[PDB]
Amino acid sequence: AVGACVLCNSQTSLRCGACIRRPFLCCKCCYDHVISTSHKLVLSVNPYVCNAPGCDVTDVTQLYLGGMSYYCKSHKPPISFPLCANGQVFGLYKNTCVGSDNVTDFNAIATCDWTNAGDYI
């Protein structure tokens, strides 16, 4: 299932796993959120974590694409390439994603505790 970037309304195939509502995010916006927020888990048509037996690598920056499946750096097929690079994350609509400037408010919403008056303000 695909959707429009919550900060761009551009079609995308990425949602942050650590986010509560997991909104659709363009590769640029998703990359900015993952590189800004502590959120290191991204949800796509398949989860990005290492597909090796026992291996539990979750940080997408540490993960590498391989034999039609994600891998960690240690468990890498001979020819591999890190997923997160060039200010974007590997996925669908990567070319057509536009990128906006709302990473600050999105990070604040995804990291606030709603206890203060900032959430309502």
Add this chain to the structure above:
Amino acid sequence: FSSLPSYAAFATAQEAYEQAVANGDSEVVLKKLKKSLNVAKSEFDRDAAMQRKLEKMADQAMTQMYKQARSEDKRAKVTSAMQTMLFTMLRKLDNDALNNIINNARDGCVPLNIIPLTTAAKLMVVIPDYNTYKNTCDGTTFTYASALWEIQQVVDADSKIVQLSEISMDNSPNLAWPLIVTALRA
């Protein structure tokens, strides 16, 4: 793979060796440039190879889970795709009785059971008004599904046995509108 640093080193070696071979300087000079050429072609072709390889693995993953997404959405939408396709074939074929009953259902006149194929086997139709009666139910003769039927009993919503000749414009409001016509083929 023209915009590569390895491409740049290979081009520099190419230019220097071309100058040497055009000017004809010496033997060891061209050997040095040929060494450099072998080195430059080595790390300019090996990296071109594995970068195009990574490019086509990227394409493989793209097309793979692209097909995955297409399959999932298709199996989500089958439940309406089938109906649309069926209606398209229907409005393409257009048998006379088919369109007749289609329109009768469209205005709200449908059979309550399966249409039989013999002069016997009473079939029940629900007609919720009196205009369609004039359109279809003329006296005891009911022309439905491109066939003639003799009306044998009409009943209203409150199960009151409705007489044939009693039905008229003036008394039409004083009659339970969802009438049921039970008829046999003629």
Add this chain to the structure above:
Amino acid sequence: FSSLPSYAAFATAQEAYEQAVANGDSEVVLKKLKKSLNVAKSEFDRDAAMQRKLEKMADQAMTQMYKQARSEDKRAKVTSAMQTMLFTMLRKLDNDALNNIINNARDGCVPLNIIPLTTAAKLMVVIPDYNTYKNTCDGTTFTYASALWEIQQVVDADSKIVQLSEISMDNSPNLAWPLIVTALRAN
């Protein structure tokens, strides 16, 4: 392969090479630098090649033996499931009729087909049509296999309760007709 003794040897050989090259010494100096570069490359050959194969074999061994552990855990789970299924099916059969009819056997060994034929406490009958139902299960009770059977509950194909009064000649074509009748051992 970055922190290796051959890496250090190549690093110092290259340091000597660059130092004496920027110095601009004799041709024999350059030949010595080339020889040092060679031998250091030789050294760095195995130390950057063997370890890769060692890592590969270690990784495949890890995959294999992890899979072995997973297999044994699955084996334990299936064994527990099988034995609990046996022990839970067993505890709903031991009528005294079973011991009774096994004692009369000459050695205990009896044909299998008779055990439900004598000890079963419930009977299901599948009926194709009303004609068959007429001369088999007429009335609230009847007999079969030399015992009395009382009819409790009758269902149609769609698993709907059907009253015995509704089962008649005129009312027959109004029901699905794989009729199921379950009965108790009347005594």
Add this chain to the structure above:
Amino acid sequence: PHEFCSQHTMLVKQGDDYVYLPYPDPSRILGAGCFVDDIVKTDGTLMIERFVSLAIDAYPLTKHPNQEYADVFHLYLQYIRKLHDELTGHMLDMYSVMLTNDNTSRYWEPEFYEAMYTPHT
């Protein structure tokens, strides 16, 4: 033989002499093309090897006296081609990249199919 394992035997000229070729019924092939389960062949763009495999068994229909069977074979070839090219358009345009080498020409020329019956492998 008139029929064996639902294969009709035909004698034609291959290479320098004559050999026997078993050819299937046409109706079965067309039915297998038409009716399928869901997603297995609901959209052939997802899965193309189906028709590739189908055509291999439809090749000896070409050498048949009546030409309709050759028409069936060529229809399969044309459909394979159309599927492949429309897949190429769909993938190249609205995604980013597909192609560095084709290597897929072979699947619409009878040279590859005829090798299936060459007495050498």
Add this chain to the structure above:
RNA sequence: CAUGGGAAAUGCUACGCGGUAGUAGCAUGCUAGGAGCAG
């Protein structure tokens, strides 16, 4: 108008072998996945 030995030294070039690495090609064997046909 009747032409010069041995040795080592430093190349330069050519020739032979082996290794290592890298690249590319070929054939194969296994495995996995996906598919189609026959009984």
